[PDB]
Amino acid sequence: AASGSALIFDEEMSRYKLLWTDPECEIEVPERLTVSYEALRTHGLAQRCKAVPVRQATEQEILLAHSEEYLEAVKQTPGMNVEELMAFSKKYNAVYFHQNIYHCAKLAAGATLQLVDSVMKREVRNGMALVRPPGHHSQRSAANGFCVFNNVAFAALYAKKNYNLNRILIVDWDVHHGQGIQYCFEEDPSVLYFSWHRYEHQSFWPNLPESDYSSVGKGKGSGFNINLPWNKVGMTNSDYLAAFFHVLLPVAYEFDPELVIVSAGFDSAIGDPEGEMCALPEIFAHLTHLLMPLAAGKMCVVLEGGYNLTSLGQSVCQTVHSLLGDPTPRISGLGTACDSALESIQNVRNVQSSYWSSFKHLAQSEVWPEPLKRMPASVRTVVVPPPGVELTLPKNCQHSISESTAKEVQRIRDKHFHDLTDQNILRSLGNIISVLDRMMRSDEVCNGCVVVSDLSVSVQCALQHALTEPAERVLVVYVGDGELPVKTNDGKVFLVQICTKETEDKCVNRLTLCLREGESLTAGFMQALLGLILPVAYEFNPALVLGIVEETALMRVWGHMTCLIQGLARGRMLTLLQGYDKDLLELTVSALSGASISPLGPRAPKPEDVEMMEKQRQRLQERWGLLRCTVSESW
Numbered sequence: 192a193a194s195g196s197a198l199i200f201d202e203e204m205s206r207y208k209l210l211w212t213d214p215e216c217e218i219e220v221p222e223r224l225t226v227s228y229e230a231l232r233t234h235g236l237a238q239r240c241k242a243v244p245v246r247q248a249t250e251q252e253i254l255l256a257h258s259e260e261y262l263e264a265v266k267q268t269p270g271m272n273v274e275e276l277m278a279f280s281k282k283y284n285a286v287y288f289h290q291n292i293y294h295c296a297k298l299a300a301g302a303t304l305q306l307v308d309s310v311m312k313r314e315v316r317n318g319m320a321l322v323r324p325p326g327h328h329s330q331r332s333a334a335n336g337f338c339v340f341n342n343v344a345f346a347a348l349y350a351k352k353n354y355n356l357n358r359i360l361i362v363d364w365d366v367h368h369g370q371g372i373q374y375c376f377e378e379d380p381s382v383l384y385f386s387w388h389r390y391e392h393q394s395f396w397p398n399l400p401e402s403d404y405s406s407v408g409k410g411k412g413s414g415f416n417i418n419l420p421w422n423k424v425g426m427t428n429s430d431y432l433a434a435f436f437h438v439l440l441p442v443a444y445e446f447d448p449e450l451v452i453v454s455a456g457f458d459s460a461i462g463d464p465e466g467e468m469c470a471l472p473e474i475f476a477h478l479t480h481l482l483m484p485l486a487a488g489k490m491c492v493v494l495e496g497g498y499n500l501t502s503l504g505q506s507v508c509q510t511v512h513s514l515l516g517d518p519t520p521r522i523s524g525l526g527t528a529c530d531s532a533l534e535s536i537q538n539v540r541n542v543q544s545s546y547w548s549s550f551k552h553l554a555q556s557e558v559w560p561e562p563l564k565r566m567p568a569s570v571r572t573v574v575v576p577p578p579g580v581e582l583t584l585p586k587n588c589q590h591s592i593s594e595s596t597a598k599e600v601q602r603i604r605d606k607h608f609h610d611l612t613d614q615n616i617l618r619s620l621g622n623i624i625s626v627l628d629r630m631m632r633s634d635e636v637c638n639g640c641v642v643v644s645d646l647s648v649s650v651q652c653a654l655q656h657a658l659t660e661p662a663e664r665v666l667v668v669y670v671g672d673g674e675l676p677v678k679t680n681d682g683k684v685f686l687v688q689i690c691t692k693e694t695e696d697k698c699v700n701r702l703t704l705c706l707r708e709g710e711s712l713t714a715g716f717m718q719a720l721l722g723l724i725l726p727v728a729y730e731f732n733p734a735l736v737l738g739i740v741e742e743t744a745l746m747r748v749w750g751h752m753t754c755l756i757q758g759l760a761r762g763r764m765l766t767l768l769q770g771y772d773k774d775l776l777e778l779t780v781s782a783l784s785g786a787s788i789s790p791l792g793p794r795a796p797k798p799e800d801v802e803m804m805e806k807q808r809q810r811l812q813e814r815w816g817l818l819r820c821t822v823s824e825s826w
């Protein structure tokens with residue numbers, strides 16, 4: 192029953208600043224914070240967020256990750272003049288101190304804990320803290336790289352201590368390596384740390400051997416540390432999405448964290464003077480989106496870096512938009528990760544293969560343009576159960592006709608289905624059309640679910656009506672066996688079929704997954720979802736998703752499926768379920784509407800299934816480059 196998104200912020204954290212000439216520190220300015228709140232205010236997103244107030248972290252809380260000695264040294268800095276502050280700063284690397292910075296660091300820390308309490312008490316579903324100074328570089332007894340105290344380290348330890356959590360995921364998508372966080376949880380298997388970061392074969396700051404893919408943790412923590420070094424600059428949306436689909440999410444869903452914490456630095460975004468990567472802000476709408484099915488949505492985004500004041504606010508707004516569940520922007524031009532990225536992706540996968548049952552088969556050889564507006568839909572979701580059925584609906588849904596819509600069904604009938612008169616089927620067809628009309632052209636409805644009786648006529652009308660809408664491209668996800676009125680010959684339709692009997696597949700616009708039924712089914716299905724289905728879908732960039740389920744269908748995966756596949760097509764998905772099922776219709780509507788998803792926790796899948804999936808990657812990765820997670824073989 193949790194709802195809303197906290198936005199923790201306070202203008203006091205912008206009242207410390209660099210007080211002497213130092214060109215390497217110039218970039219880290221108070222204006223980073225004011226630009227960010229103001230952007231969220233301009234776009235109406237700050238107003239939609241519960242503004243939880245900042246507090247100071249207590250001394251007892253700071254000692255969870257820091258040392259009496261180093262805390263007492265920093266506690267002395269508010270009494271210092273500028274000479275003394277320069278001297279204290281020079282005992283550390285890439286960090287300046289200010290009379291007010293111990294004050295703000297305590298606030299940046301306290302703000303993060305405020306976010307943790309709000310999320311874990313169900314007062315909000317998720318949140319984001321706009322803090323200065325950053326956290327992820329600082330260590331138990333030192334400040335480093337603009338950080339004083341490790342705000343995200345605090346959050347996990349705090350959430351460990353006061354909520355008795357066993358599994359916490361920390362995703363550090365900042366462009367620098369959060370070495371403070373890795374040090375803190377090195378031997379700890381209850382806090383899984385994933386970081387990607389600019390490395391350039393250790394030439395990039397902080398220049399640490401520990402930053403490479405080979406550091407997997409120590410002792411009982413081996414496997415619970417994951418570094419993905421970028422060894423070239425200019426990494427693109429396709430490189431970030433490849434890292435999620437083929438490293439982070441496979442490990443994240445098997446881990447099944449009880450809470451997700453993001454070190455969200457946006458120096459990894461296009462335009463940043465320190466990161467020099469090429470991902471558009473829109474990418475962060477999806478990095479957020481892809482993780483929200485974890486831990487029932489309990490996500491704590493915590494600002495780290497970001498230095499181009501323009502690129503900064505755009506990426507913050509994309510993250511909060513997604514936190515509030517607004518529709519995700521379509522990403523165009525996705526394709527293969529570059530060669531350096533595939534090398535890094537392939538190296539970390541191989542070294543981690545001893546630890547995760549998603550890479551296990553790898554071990555035994557058998558300046559840029561503006562984002563476009565994302566206002567949420569009038570009504571998010573439209574439901575059309577059988578006539579007579581009426582269950583209760585979330586606050587943002589609605590039941591289903593028109594005269595125009597009725598002339599089409601008659602028009603469609605006489606042309607293509609002359610020998611059909613079932614006034615029930617012909618109702619479904621009217622519903623499909625009218626619900627698609629409200630999705631494809633009105634910004635009013637987002638997605639919908641229609642229960643249907645005859646599948647073949649329902650799908651045909653759904654599909655053909657969408658193509659003339661115009662929908663340049665339609666992705667079709669079908670769970671069932673048998674033929675289906677689909678023409679996957681031109682580039683306008685891609686079909687994903689999940690069936691029980693295998694099928695030699697000729698066409699390359701198709702992905703047929705035959706999963707040997709059993710206890711294996713759920714674990715393997717979701718390897719294929721993150722490993723194959725999402726990467727193809729993302730490259731395809733559909734205008735509309737059409738989900739279909741035949742009546743002889745198991746169910747425990749459809750919510751994750753529905754939640755994730757809404758990253759395509761600005762969330763415009765129509766779902767045709769054949770036959771009434773209270774539970775499935777309830778689950779489909781719940782996921783479509785933005786609700787949180789029940790986690791899965793636990794198995795590992797059958798080799799006949801993982802081999803079936805790698806035959807599919809082999810058969811498709813040359814058409815669909817985003818499927819690649821190795822370097823191409825050169826002639």
Ligand SMILES: O=C(NO)c1ccc(Cn2ccc3ccccc32)cc1
Pocket residue numbers: 215216284285286325328336337365367396456458465495496497
């Ligand atoms: O945004 C960040 N991290 O998340 C981050 C960005 C840039 C730096 C580099 N840098 C800053 C001052 C200085 C002095 C000497 C050597 C290097 C230095 C460090 C950290």
Ligand SMILES: [K+]
Pocket residue numbers: 363364365366367368369386387388
């Ligand atoms: K990072």
Ligand SMILES: [K+]
Pocket residue numbers: 376377378379380381382383384408412415416
């Ligand atoms: K760890």
Ligand SMILES: [Zn+2]
Pocket residue numbers: 365366367456458495496497
């Ligand atoms: Zn950074």
